[PDB]
Amino acid sequence: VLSEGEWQLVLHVWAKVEADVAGHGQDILIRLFKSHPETLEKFDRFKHLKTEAEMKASEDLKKHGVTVLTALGAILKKKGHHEAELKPLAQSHATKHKIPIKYLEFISEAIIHVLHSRHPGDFGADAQGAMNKALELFRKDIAAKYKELGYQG
Ligand code: HEM
């Protein structure tokens, strides 16, 4: 479980992410798609995007960054008591979208990367470790739901 101090470091930098959810969402989805191209295949709606320039110019992809970051934000603010927020997400990413857990690791590493570039002063190693611990909790609670549904993997 994160400490209260750890949750504080997480929510403090998240409050900065919220000053521009759109730009963050963009960078994060683009970094995911460049680093792990197999991830982009899972979206019929973004599959036609071939370059970074194309991805940067797509209003829809930017609309979907907002969506994803808003969902994650609602979960972060619960500081671990995220049962009702996490249940729908896992059911859908397992049974409808077909997203292995590993990809959830990839997107985590992208989020950490982008938070670092954009918020150095608020994202030292101590905030880094705290954010990692939160995104592990996330992915740990999701995996247990996947396992329930028979999709562990
Ligand atoms: C922080 C982690 C992530 C969050 C919070 C997140 C959030 C969401 C939300 C809120 C939706 C729309 C509601 C729904 O369909 O359940 C969604 C849709 C989707 N997600 Fe994720 N997601 C995450 C990770 C991923 C990853 C890593 C992949 C693929 C590698 C992925 C693939 C999908 C697909 C294919 C859809 C449907 C998109 C569309 O066609 O409109 N998601 N996600």
Curated annotation (Swiss-Prot):
Its main location: cytoplasm. PROSITE patterns: GLOBIN. The modification Phosphothreonine is found at T67. GO terms for biological process: removal of superoxide radicals. Its EC number is 1.7.-.-, 1.11.1.-. GO terms for molecular function: heme binding; metal ion binding; nitrite reductase activity; oxygen binding; oxygen carrier activity; peroxidase activity. It catalyses: Fe(III)-heme b-[protein] + nitric oxide + H2O = Fe(II)-heme b-[protein] + nitrite + 2 H(+); H2O2 + AH2 = A + 2 H2O. InterPro entries: Globin, Globin-like_sf, Myoglobin. Pfam families: Globin. It is found in: Cytoplasm, Sarcoplasm. Residues 1-147 form the Globin domain. It is an enzyme of class 1 (oxidoreductase). GO terms for cellular component: extracellular exosome; sarcoplasm. Belongs to the globin family. Monomeric. Monomeric heme protein which primary function is to store oxygen and facilitate its diffusion within muscle tissues. Reversibly binds oxygen through a pentacoordinated heme iron and enables its timely and efficient release as needed during periods of heightened demand. Depending on the oxidative conditions of tissues and cells, and in addition to its ability to bind oxygen, it also has a nitrite reductase activity whereby it regulates the production of bioactive nitric oxide. This is Myoglobin. It comes from Physeter macrocephalus. The lineage of its organism: Eukaryota, Metazoa, Chordata, Craniata, Vertebrata.
